[PDB]
Amino acid sequence: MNVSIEEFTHFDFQLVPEPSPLDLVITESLKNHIEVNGVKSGALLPLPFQTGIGKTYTALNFLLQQMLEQVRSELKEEKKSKRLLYYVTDSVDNVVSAKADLLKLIEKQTVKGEPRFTLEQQEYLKAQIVHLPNQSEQLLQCSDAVLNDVLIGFNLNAERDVQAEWSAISGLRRHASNPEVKISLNRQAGYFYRNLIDRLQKKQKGADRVLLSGSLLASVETLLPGEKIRNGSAHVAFLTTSKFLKGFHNTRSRYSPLRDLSGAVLIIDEIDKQNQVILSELCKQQAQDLIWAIRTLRANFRDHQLESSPRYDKIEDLFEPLRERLEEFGTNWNLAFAFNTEGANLNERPVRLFSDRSFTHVSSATHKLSLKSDFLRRKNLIFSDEKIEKHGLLTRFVNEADVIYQWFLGTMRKAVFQYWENVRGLEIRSLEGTFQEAVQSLLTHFNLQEFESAVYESFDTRGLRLSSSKSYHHTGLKLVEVAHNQGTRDTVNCKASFLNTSPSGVLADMVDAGAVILGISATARADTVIHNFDFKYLNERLGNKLLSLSREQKQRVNNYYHSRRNYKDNGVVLTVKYLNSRDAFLDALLEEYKPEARSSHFILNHYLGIAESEQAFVRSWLSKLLASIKAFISSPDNRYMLSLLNRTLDTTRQNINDFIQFCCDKWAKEFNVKTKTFFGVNADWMRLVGYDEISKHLNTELGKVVVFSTYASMGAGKNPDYAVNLALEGESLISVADVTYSTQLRSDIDSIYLEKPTQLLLSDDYSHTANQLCQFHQILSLQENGELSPKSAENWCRQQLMGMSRERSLQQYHQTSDYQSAVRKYIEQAVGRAGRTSLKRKQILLFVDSGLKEILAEESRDPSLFSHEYVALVNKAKSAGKSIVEDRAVRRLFNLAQRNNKDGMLSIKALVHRLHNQPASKSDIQEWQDIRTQLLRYPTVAFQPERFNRLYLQSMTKGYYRYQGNLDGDPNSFEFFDRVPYGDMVSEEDCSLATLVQNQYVRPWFERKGFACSWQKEANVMTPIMFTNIYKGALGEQAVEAVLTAFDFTFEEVPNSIYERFDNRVIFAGIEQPIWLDSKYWKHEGNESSEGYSSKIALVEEEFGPSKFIYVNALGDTSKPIRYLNSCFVETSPQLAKVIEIPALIDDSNADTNRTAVQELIKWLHHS
């Protein structure tokens, strides 16, 4: 019967096989993480292990060592739960093959020549590994006996609706004909598995829970592999990325690994493609109607209450601010009425709004759309005003509704956590165990059950969660469609689709949740945010949790690779050629193809079926290809050629194939070498005769082979190598390693042709909304990294919302260096997946589309870990000298300066708008004071900021820079640094700080408050918006406050009714009338109207009655007269004036206080 853990008692856990340098790399990198950080902290380790070097062997050996560590810990600690281990990759085939190789490694591992594990130990180790396929394949791999046992054991054998479905599926199973039956069988398998597992979980949740043991337990574990994980029988899981993201079922519920990642280990193969896989999963979420959701939340949170039992302790306080916000919002926007549209152009096309939620907002409407409540009609109408009214906009309403909805979801997450805490306290059982019960209890107390599904999905994508850091990767985007409701022509809905995080945010969340992640890929650290994770963001967010290899470790890996791929010492030569298009060569070949035709254009248009418009394009990619083939046929020693194109040569282009075939035959006859061709070698072809035919032909026939495939067809685990027959091959082969004829003798592709990859922007074919979200995510990621300026990104977003074509999106993308990095990544993967063996020809021919040369000449990374073919390509490209290109870092600096300035401008405008809205909030006052305090304390910072990163920009100079833009105009038109040699300059001298602090009163105040008296010469300096609108005002306010306090004045906090209208209130000698103060840092024109000042004064007196008003200037010339003004800002006598103006408190020539002005102010107060 099943092997037990008591069979490892005499096993020695210190005896290990001789470790390869890669194993040392992994272990040495991971040990310093446990030293520097703790044992409970996660890590992210990207390992650039290229294919053929033994990366799968290394990963599986690491996994086996983790298994042995778990067994040793269990023996020593004789009940801690098992540490979960996951092997994740994109493809199902790679998962199955990796599990097979792990089992083989367990079976056939030897130490010092003796077998490492006994039969019982081998069986026990194999019992801990489980594979989690999709539900259809899970059902179809279970025998009828197992399913009958499961149905009998759970009393489902008499339900009719269950037995009919199972009988139908069994009948389909016993009649497995051509795949026409198989598609239907798979669909019904999925549906039946869903229904059966739902019923089983419902039965197990209730009181009449079936006891599982013996044969029933075995059958259930066969049907539900996750039950093995839940019980503790297994702790190693092989699964795909999508399966990992969705989760798997056990007898209780659906287990989500993302919610239980503390302590787990992930081995992610081909990590850089998981970015695209995760994005595709994220873009499939369900859209929400915001009007319905907000109306439901407002209606149900008005009255319904939670129970006051100890299980709900301090949970009700989590929801009170949401209730107040909902009630205020519903009062403001009149949610008692339904919504509709009226006007021209609002009916033919629905309204589309896009928001990045911070500073990028785009609308499909040509004119701003307004929102007005008609009380006579009892309606909320969306208008188009053909004539700025801040209140009453559709964008404001949509943004606030989205904020409230996300707030509700986050509060539900917090309440679930609190409920788990309380339940742990009482019944003394994990977070994943009480999650569903908590959600159900909370939603049924509030009568909000219809949000159930939504909440679950939220906890999937935001239950994985240093706060005021701003980044697209953890805020996301929102796409809203306003359109008429279905079936009714007088109401509208606002369907919103969200991306609450990017794939990089998901990865950072997993690392911060305590998971240790090993990402294995040769292009793991590529410089693309489209085809890879954003590693700048990951670095910023993780710090030392993002591990890396030292120079010595990299050199060890390089030495190992060179020792296993010694080319130079074994006489292997890589010949690289760049092929330009040749019109005369193709013309001659075409004329020979059809000698009776008049011109080659006639043959192209009529015989090959090429439309006249596309002929030129076909004349470029054909001739080049043909040229390569010719150079392959005239080569004597070469046998195997792979041609990587962008389009497959299936029967759809059959005519073209014939032409190529003709040419091949001719060239064969010209060079007396047999040549076989394999057209249309794609994935469906491999599902049929499966690339074994090419290997057999190379093994049994003495001719050349040319294979026509694409980049997409050559996956990670395709392995295009053949068995060598030394009779057919001459003496050309060379062994480049030191292994003693390891097992079979295999060779690889010998000649390769590479085309320039084309469709390098991702797309989603799941639905129109998923594709829209994918495109918007790509634009926003490019803006976040700095590849795009905010103006270019906003224009691109506007075009995407208008609905442009893919060609225009590709043209937009081609202007970025991210595009070149993606091209080079594709080339590197292509040349790396073709050197998987150790037997090499005398000459290896690389033929490259010439359009790649200018790209490949721009490679600048360390070639310490590049493959030999890639190094040869780069050297051949660079052999043409150097070309003048724009530095990526400098352009990114300019773009990021513009981005930070624009974000700061829009954020400051929104904050000021929220402040001038009575009644104000308290978080807004806190944010305003925190911004001012941070700028005062740290005008410049040395390290990259974390909490206030958008208040600063990185300048090429230290402590100062130049700019030219209108701070009250368009944020997209700002220019920075050397682009504006003569422009407004931001530094310590332009703010007159040094002269200000020289005064005897302000300086002690600055010291006791901690404010900087000078600017450190640093690279991070505040953006122009904060320098002009925040920093100078703070300097003036602090100087005035210090000067007045030194003269025995008292200050109190301004209340929210008049906030930001006046900085402080003056209290002196107990004058019972209120005194109001407003300061300007230096002499500047009063752009605010005198009527505006009168409006402010009248508004203030409307709440506080008569009072005194002071307008003071902190710094200036102290010889100017002291003015008295009336409510209309007209000069009046001191016996009737209400406004007192102080031109300067400290002189700008000697930093001397205007004590005469202070004495006159004191006398004025005594005259009141």
Partner DNA sequence: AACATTACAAAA
Q: Is residue 492 classed as helix, strand or coil in its secondary structure?
A: strand
Could you say which residues in the range 910-949 bind DNA, by CB under 7 A? none
For DNA, give the closer residue by CB, 542 or 760.
Answer: 760
Q: Does residue 202 belong to the site contacting DNA (CB under 7 A)?
A: no
For DNA, give the closer residue by CB, 237 or 1097.
Answer: 237
Q: Does residue 536 belong to the site contacting DNA (CB under 7 A)?
A: no
Could you say which residues in the range 123-162 bind DNA, by CB under 7 A? 133-137
Q: Among 119-127, 322-330, 404-412, 803-811, which window interacts with DNA (CB under 7 A)?
A: 803-811
User: Which one of residues 367, 808, 861, 1009 is an interface residue with DNA (CB under 7 A)?
Assistant: 808
For DNA, give the closer residue by CB, 602 or 617.
Answer: 617
CB of 524 to DNA, least distance (A): 20
DSSP character string of 212-256: --HHHHHHHHHH-HHHHHHHTS--EEEEEHHHHHH-EE-SSSEE-
User: Which one of residues 616, 689, 994, 1069 is an interface residue with DNA (CB under 7 A)?
Assistant: 616
Q: Among 536-544, 609-617, 839-847, 1017-1025, which window interacts with DNA (CB under 7 A)?
A: 609-617
For DNA, give the closer residue by CB, 225 or 1143.
Answer: 225
d(CA 55, CA 62): 11
Q: Does residue 182 belong to the site contacting DNA (CB under 7 A)?
A: no
C-beta separation of 435 from 747 below 8 A = no
Q: Does residue 802 belong to the site contacting DNA (CB under 7 A)?
A: no
CB of 458 to DNA, least distance (A): 17
Q: Does residue 811 belong to the site contacting DNA (CB under 7 A)?
A: yes
For DNA, give the closer residue by CB, 254 or 556.
Answer: 254
CB of 684 to DNA, least distance (A): 6
CB of 776 to DNA, least distance (A): 16
Q: Does residue 275 belong to the site contacting DNA (CB under 7 A)?
A: no
Select from 297, 311, 287 the least CA-distant residue to 448: 297
Could you say which residues in the range 384-403 bind DNA, by CB under 7 A? none
Residue 297: both structure tokens together? 């939340």
User: Which one of residues 77, 78, 765, 887 is an interface residue with DNA (CB under 7 A)?
Assistant: 765
User: Which one of residues 20, 73, 91, 555 is an interface residue with DNA (CB under 7 A)?
Assistant: 91
Could you say which residues in the range 982-1011 bind DNA, by CB under 7 A? none
Q: Report which secondary-structure segment, H or E, holds 1008.
A: helix 1002-1009
Torsions phi, psi of 847, nearest 5? -115, 130
C-beta separation of 155 from 214 below 8 A = no
Select from 939, 1043, 951 the least CA-distant residue to 993: 939
User: Which one of residues 715, 983, 1033, 1074 is an interface residue with DNA (CB under 7 A)?
Assistant: 715
User: What angle separates helix 144-153 from helix 161-173, to the nearest 10 degrees?
Assistant: 170
User: Which one of residues 287, 546, 810, 985 is an interface residue with DNA (CB under 7 A)?
Assistant: 810
Going by DSSP bridges, is the β-strand pair 236-240/85-89 parallel, antiparallel, or unpaired? parallel
Q: Among 183-191, 347-355, 962-970, 1153-1161, which window interacts with DNA (CB under 7 A)?
A: 183-191
Q: Does residue 504 belong to the site contacting DNA (CB under 7 A)?
A: no
CB of 199 to DNA, least distance (A): 14
| Residues contributing to the annotated binding site for ADP | 51-52, 54-57, 564
Q: Among 470-478, 760-768, 861-869, 894-902, which window interacts with DNA (CB under 7 A)?
A: 760-768
Site string for DNA, 644-683 (x = CB under 7 A): --xxx---------------------------------xx
User: What angle separates helix 161-173 from helix 179-205, to the nearest 10 degrees?
Assistant: 150
Exposed / middle / buried, residue 741 (Cβ in 10 Å: 0-12, 13-18, 19+): exposed
d(CA 107, CA 99): 12
User: Which one of residues 240, 441, 785, 838 is an interface residue with DNA (CB under 7 A)?
Assistant: 240
Q: Does residue 710 belong to the site contacting DNA (CB under 7 A)?
A: yes
Question: Taking CA 691 as the corner, what is the angle to CA 690 and CA 694, rounded to the nearest 5 degrees?
Answer: 140
Q: Which residues contact 78 (CB under 8 A, 6 or more apart)?
A: none
User: Which one of residues 805, 966, 1087, 1133 is an interface residue with DNA (CB under 7 A)?
Assistant: 805
Select from 263, 153, 161, 249 the least CA-distant residue to 197: 249
d(CA 497, CA 772): 10
For DNA, give the closer residue by CB, 70 or 222.
Answer: 222
For DNA, give the closer residue by CB, 386 or 765.
Answer: 765
CB of 756 to DNA, least distance (A): 8
For DNA, give the closer residue by CB, 759 or 860.
Answer: 759
β strands within 59-172, DSSP E: 85-89, 110-111, 114-115, 129-131
For DNA, give the closer residue by CB, 29 or 521.
Answer: 521
| Residues contributing to the annotated binding site for Mg(2+) | 56, 269-270
Torsions phi, psi of 673, nearest 5? -130, 130
Q: Report CA torsion sign: 105, 111, 117, 119.
A: positive
Select from 267, 269, 273 the least CA-distant residue to 129: 267
User: Which one of residues 814, 947, 979, 1166 is an interface residue with DNA (CB under 7 A)?
Assistant: 814
C-beta separation of 712 from 645 below 8 A = no
Q: Among 237-245, 566-574, 696-704, 1155-1163, which window interacts with DNA (CB under 7 A)?
A: 237-245
Q: Does residue 617 belong to the site contacting DNA (CB under 7 A)?
A: yes
Site string for DNA, 325-364 (x = CB under 7 A): ----------------------------------------
Exposure string for 160-199, b = 16+ CB within 10 A, e = fewer: eebeebbeebeebbeeeeeeeeeeebbebbbebbeebbeb
DSSP character string of 202-215: HHHHSSSPPP--HH
d(CA 876, CA 879): 5
d(CA 899, CA 46): 29
CB of 93 to DNA, least distance (A): 6
Q: Does residue 734 belong to the site contacting DNA (CB under 7 A)?
A: no
User: Which one of residues 161, 614, 1088, 1131 is an interface residue with DNA (CB under 7 A)?
Assistant: 614
Q: Which residues contact 883 (CB under 8 A, 6 or more apart)?
A: 854, 857
Site string for DNA, 93-112 (x = CB under 7 A): x-------------------
Going by DSSP bridges, is the β-strand pair 1050-1052/1064-1067 parallel, antiparallel, or unpaired? antiparallel
CB of 180 to DNA, least distance (A): 16
CB of 881 to DNA, least distance (A): 25
Cis ω for the linkage preceding 757 (within 30 of 0): no
CB of 954 to DNA, least distance (A): 31
Q: How many CA atoms lie within 13 A of 1078 on its CB side?
A: 17
Exposure string for 317-356, b = 16+ CB within 10 A, e = fewer: ebbeebeebbeebbeebbbeebbbbeeeebeeeebbbbbb
Q: Which residues contact 654 (CB under 8 A, 6 or more apart)?
A: none
Q: Among 186-194, 365-373, 869-877, 1015-1023, which window interacts with DNA (CB under 7 A)?
A: 186-194
For DNA, give the closer residue by CB, 403 or 616.
Answer: 616
| Residues contributing to the annotated binding site | 51-52, 54-57, 269-270, 564
C-beta separation of 493 from 485 below 8 A = yes
Residue 209: both structure tokens together? 């829970």
Q: Does residue 824 belong to the site contacting DNA (CB under 7 A)?
A: no
CB of 691 to DNA, least distance (A): 12
Count of residues interacting with DNA (CB under 7 A): 47
Q: Binding residues for DNA, per CB under 7 A?
A: 90-93, 133-137, 186-187, 190-191, 194, 239-240, 242-243, 246, 248, 280, 614, 616-617, 646-648, 682-684, 710, 712-713, 715, 758-761, 763, 765, 805-808, 810-811, 814
